[PDB]
């Protein structure tokens, strides 16, 4: 299966606009996080499926725990949410050498404000001005009128919990 295009891509998508690649009809990192929900990872190699979906994005180190069923936080509630009955695997590895600039890497953003939480596998790419007060904003950012997206601004000297991490989520359909 063409997994090389997903893992070895030059640039990953922002978590708010996470990318999904459908893979069907087909057949390693130094230190990484690899776990599966609903099935053992030794048994995934012996299980036939019709389609496998690969979701890829970039988040902080300390946010990787949110990529799991039944979690909360800015990523799980406003960016990428998994259903409680999630059956798949989660892969995440350190990408500090690729997605960190001394002056700040502004390729990756996350949704910091939203009126409600995301449903599972819901994507929201809108950029409407978020109204935090009682007065309308009319599309003008200002006091109590926030732009809903925020940059990570990855720097190479940040701590391990603040370094950028590339995440791949594998869902299975059969």
């Amino acid at each position, epitope marked *: 299966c063409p997994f090389d295009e997903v893992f070895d891509a030059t640039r990953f998508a922002s978590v708010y606009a996470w990318n999904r690649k459908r893979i069907s009809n087909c057949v390693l990192a130094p230190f990484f996080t690899f776990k599966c929900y609903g099935v053992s990872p030794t048994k995934l190699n012996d299980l036939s499926f019709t389609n496998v979906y690969a979701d890829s994005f970039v988040i902080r180190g300390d946010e990787v725990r949110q990529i799991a069923p039944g979690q909360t936080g800015n990523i799980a509630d406003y960016n990428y949410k998994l259903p409680d009955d999630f059956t798949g695997c989660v892969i995440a590895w350190n990408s500090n050498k690729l997605d960190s600039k001394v002056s700040g890497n502004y390729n990756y953003l996350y949704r910091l404000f939203r009126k409600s939480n995301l449903k599972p596998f819901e994507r929201d790419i809108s950029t409407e001005i978020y109204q935090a007060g009682n007065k309308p904003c009319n599309g003008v950012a200002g006091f*109590n009128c926030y732009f809903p997206l925020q940059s990570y601004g990855f720097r190479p000297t940040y701590g391990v919990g603040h370094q950028p991490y590339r995440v791949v989520v594998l869902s299975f359909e059969l």
Partner: nanobody
Amino acid sequence: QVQLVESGGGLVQPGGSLRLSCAISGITLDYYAVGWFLQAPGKEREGISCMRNWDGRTVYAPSVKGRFTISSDNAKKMVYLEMDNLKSEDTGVYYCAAGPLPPGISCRIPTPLGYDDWGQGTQVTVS
């Protein structure tokens, strides 16, 4: 690591003036915001003025608009907060905060979210 150290403040009678300073260091981001937050007794941290670095655009709270002025020096080293016509409602602890910001986006107040580095705070008493 980023350091934000405040100076100034103290006791002042109503109607007087005061200037706070926020010495920033270690910020190499191309796009970031610097804001001032007021922690009134009983209330929590709320932004009253912020600015973005590249063009200096500022947004103020209605409580302080027309009386307070946040500014920066050319070297981008010191951020000031010029307080004029002070009143009892301005009493509290004042922090300066910094955080990343997307290009071409206005800085956010009064939310504390989006600011990753804070100062030690400064007590300002107007009575």
